[PDB]
């Protein structure tokens, strides 16, 4: 099964304040495992999933120092961004970073990731070759030229291919008691009265992990994009997710309708219909 690791970092300034706040969050296979936040009393990286209390005094200490180093890097960059965009002081601003590595089921590097955004928008990103940069904005060509001239790419390429891949392998052995596991959806259909002679069939999928899931309704073979009603997949808040798709139906005709649930955890898709 493939694997991954990410650090999502952010720095935010507001018009009141003297300094921005910097926050970092680490993820293994998309589950949060570490976090740092400059608003805290004692800013430190903290373990975020039972399996990270393993790392000793040295880990947390050394990662914390890196975090205070990122924070200054982010402070100086906001300041520079403000001038690149000719933004007068008096606004809120955001700079965000995503970094890390995807592994194949063989545990080999599949793809490195380095991307940045400023005010919510793509600012500069490391291309998949880990050699060249994409930066769209006129204002960003400055940064892209400083980074090319300074060999930045070859540095991040080293971290993406070496230290990143390595520490993920390590974190992968350390918690091999959860980190592969998928929870399959349990699905059911509920019956709701609606407009005269018409009811709502609402297919629920519940209890599943990871979040990616597809729900579909058919009228004897024909998929209903016609105005189906779904909700965005949502956290149950116990680590599992929920989704539902509903359709309006002729009253009585409610067995020409089947709900299918597609999910990676499943032996095969579920097939479902209202059952009174």
């Amino acid at each position: 099964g493939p694997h991954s690791m990410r650090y999502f970092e952010t720095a935010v300034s507001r018009p009141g304040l003297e300094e921005p706040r910097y926050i970092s969050v680490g993820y293994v296979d998309n589950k949060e495992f570490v976090r740092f936040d400059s608003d805290a009393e004692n800013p430190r990286y903290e373990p975020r999933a039972p399996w990270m209390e393993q790392e000793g005094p040295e880990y947390w200490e050394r990662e914390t120092q890196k975090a205070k180093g990122q924070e200054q890097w982010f402070r100086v960059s906001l300041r520079n961004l403000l001038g690149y965009y000719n933004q007068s002081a008096g606004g809120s601003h955001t700079l965000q970073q995503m970094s890390g590595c995807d592994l194949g089921s063989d545990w080999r590097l599949l793809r490195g990731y380095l991307q940045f955004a400023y005010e919510g928008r793509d600012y500069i990103a490391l291309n998949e070759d880990l050699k060249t940069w994409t930066a769209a904005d006129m204002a960003a060509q400055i940064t892209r030229r400083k980074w090319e001239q300074s060999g930045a790419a070859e540095h991040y390429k080293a971290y993406l291919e070496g230290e990143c891949v390595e520490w993920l392998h390590r974190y992968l052995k350390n918690g091999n008691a959860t980190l592969l596991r998928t929870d399959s959806p349990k699905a059911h259909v509920t019956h709701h009265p609606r407009s005269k002679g018409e009811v709502t069939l609402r297919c629920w999928a519940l209890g599943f992990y990871p979040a990616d899931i597809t729900l579909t309704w058919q009228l004897n073979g024909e998929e209903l994009t016609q105005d189906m009603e779904l909700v965005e997949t949502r956290p149950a808040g116990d680590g599992t997710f929920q989704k539902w798709a509903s359709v309006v139906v002729p009253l009585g005709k409610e067995q020409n309708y089947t709900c299918r649930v597609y999910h990676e955890g499943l032996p095969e898709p579920l097939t479902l219909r209202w059952e009174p």
Partner: peptide, 9 residues
């Protein structure tokens, strides 16, 4: 363990 950044913006 997370990247440590190089040249600033």
């Amino acid at each position: 363990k997370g990247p440590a950044n190089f040249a600033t913006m």
